[PDB]
Symmetry: C3
Subunit: 137 residues, 3 copies
């Protein structure tokens, strides 16, 4: 729960983001890191933070939860959805990308982030979507 640990490299620092509004980072990663004026998030997955479980439903419900989780990590970093410069969207099914897109479009507006979108063979816990972001503070 503490975010007071940092690393120093000369004039720059690595600072941790921790928030209970997104799934806890268990093991050797952080929800997000702040360094310079950059925020690097972990690839968010559709786990409901008030349960530890993947959300009920399908791609539309998973996409929403991923983006909520991304929102809360970003805002906990002092950043926001509108300061995202680049995402990678990893999906289990490219054929239903229009459905992911329809949810995604609700979370961002002009200027939209740069983006890469690829179909992967599996994701953590069998989820259908994972999204990481680079953002500015």
């Amino acid at each position: 729960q503490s975010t007071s640990l940092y690393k120093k490299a000369g004039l720059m620092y690595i600072e941790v983001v921790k928030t209970n509004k997104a799934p806890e980072a268990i093991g050797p990663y952080s929800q997000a890191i702040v360094t310079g004026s950059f925020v690097y998030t972990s690839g968010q997955i559709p786990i409901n933070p008030q349960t530890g479980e993947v959300v009920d439903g399908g791609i539309e419900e998973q996409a929403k939860q991923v983006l909520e989780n991304l929102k809360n990590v970003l805002e906990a970093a002092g950043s926001s959805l509108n300061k995202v410069v680049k995402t990678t969207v990893f999906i289990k099914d490219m054929d239903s990308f229009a459905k992911v897109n329809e949810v995604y479009a609700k979370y961002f507006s002009e200027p939209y982030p740069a983006r890469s979108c690829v179909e992967v063979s599996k994701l953590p816990k069998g989820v259908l979507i994972e999204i990481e972001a680079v953002a500015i503070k």
Copy 2:
């Protein structure tokens, strides 16, 4: 701050993304795909022709940003078939010069519009 690249020399960004974003001295491109900007269609041919189109799109995106291929620091190359790696590499090597960008190459299951290759770049300005 944040600046959006919107160049008519690469395929238009339709939907909730941008061709590239410029923030300070850094340029983040979208994952470029072998779409002909003049037709909006995938270019004809196989991996060689698609790799070329992707790198032409990348070039034009980067240049419209005020960057270029020679200021690329990192790329990710997503390919549909790792067995055509050597062909990709031969085309790729035409577009970059020493010191070459850092790079990751992975084979994926599927790419937008059934393309065989997609490439993103982080560059400087």
Copy 3:
């Protein structure tokens, strides 16, 4: 060539190459890592033994170790380290194996841990089971 004298210039910023014979040689149109400003970008490290030039013998534990040693030595050649990594992407051939990868990975990083994305892909170079790239600071 082991020389690191070539750069690219972009106004007041520079792209500088990282080379070390302690990691597999970058052969072809890429570099082991690139240094620009206060950032280090590594290539996706694969479990090649820099001595033999071949994929290490053994299984996922051995491949995980080799990838992370390769990344260690690339970073250190850049004047950076594992301790200065801000973001990794871990591409694996088998998500079901991920606890074993995690167990090895955990030995190479300290708090605050890098941000991370982990995905399973359909194939990696030379049929390796894991590839890891990093963004670090110097």
